[PDB]
Design a protein around this ligand. Sequence first.
Ligand SMILES: Nc1ncnc2c1ncn2[C@@H]1O[C@H](COP(=O)(O)OP(=O)(O)OP(=O)(O)O)[C@@H](O)[C@H]1O
Ligand SMILES: [Mg+2]
Lengths: 20, 337
Amino acid sequence: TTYADFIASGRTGRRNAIHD
Amino acid sequence: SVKEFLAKAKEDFLKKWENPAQNTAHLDQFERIKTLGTGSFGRVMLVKHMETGNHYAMKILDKQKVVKLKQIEHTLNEKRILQAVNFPFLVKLEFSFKDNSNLYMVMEYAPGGEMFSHLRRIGRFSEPHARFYAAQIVLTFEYLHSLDLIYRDLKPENLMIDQQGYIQVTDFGFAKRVKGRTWTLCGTPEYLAPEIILSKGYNKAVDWWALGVLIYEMAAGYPPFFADQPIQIYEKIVSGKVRFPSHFSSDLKDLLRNLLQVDLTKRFGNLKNGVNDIKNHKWFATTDWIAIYQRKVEAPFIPKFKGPGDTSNFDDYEEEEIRVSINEKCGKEFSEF
Ligand SMILES: Nc1ncnc2c1ncn2[C@@H]1O[C@H](COP(=O)(O)OP(=O)(O)OP(=O)(O)O)[C@@H](O)[C@H]1O
Ligand SMILES: [Mg+2]
């Protein structure tokens, strides 16, 4: 399932911001 | 009306905007207790004002590190905007100050933790739950946009839950007062609108795309564009291809299709009627906006807080000591802070 793909992914933890 | 309230509110904001508050505390007035959170730029510590005995969240930006990440103008916008604003779903900035090494923003402590923590644990929110939060963000952006402010970092990690179970938007690190367009590539990959990544130059409308991402994530348990690394995410966003869980109401699917409109001339929030296309949408029909603004709606989830200064709704982080130099580090750069 989509939820399962999401949970096995590298970005389920907190996501910091990007920059230049 | 709402139009009358925003006018009063703009004047209040302008007086503080032109003449910002400065150096209204120092470090030794505060007990450092525990790190509440961390970011790309700064860390936040639960703190204790020793004379009043109140608890606050203090954000620590290391001046040199701000300069190496090219966030000086952004850090100056953050303090200036935050001290000027006043809304019920925005964190209150109480004090700001600097010393030789760092910049400090002491804020209202929000004991309920991040939306992120609860959303991951529970998996997803019911639609009525998501709606309670969405409405508050909708009103918050109406306020911010009327002051020519763009927010630019809406994500569950920047949405704190207070004791009453309501939203306190924190982190104004990318906030910017702009009439007309702006081109800085910033935000958080999953919440970036297609304009930002395509280097087109963009406006308020990127906050409304971000609201559509938020609603999708709150209601689904996962963002509409995820992958293992950011470049693959940027790919899916520009592709303008979204798929909805089968348990999304038809009304919700419809709200989201207008918010996650890649064509920013047809995206809700940017049209002639502005924020009303969102407020008068089918999905929000049960939402009494004035009630939401007064905080007289029953929150569906009040977090548990065993006394003041409890931090059980925040993750544990590794502590680092606060080192202050004998010498001033980037004095000219942060003079107005
Ligand atoms: N007023 C507050 N009360 C309680 N916790 C807070 C408060 N403000 C911030 N935090 C916590 O600290 C975390 C990091 O703070 P913040 O996002 O403002 O710093 P940042 O450097 O701009 O991080 P980033 O840009 O990567 O999101 C937040 O995600 C939140 O968990
Ligand atoms: Mg930030």
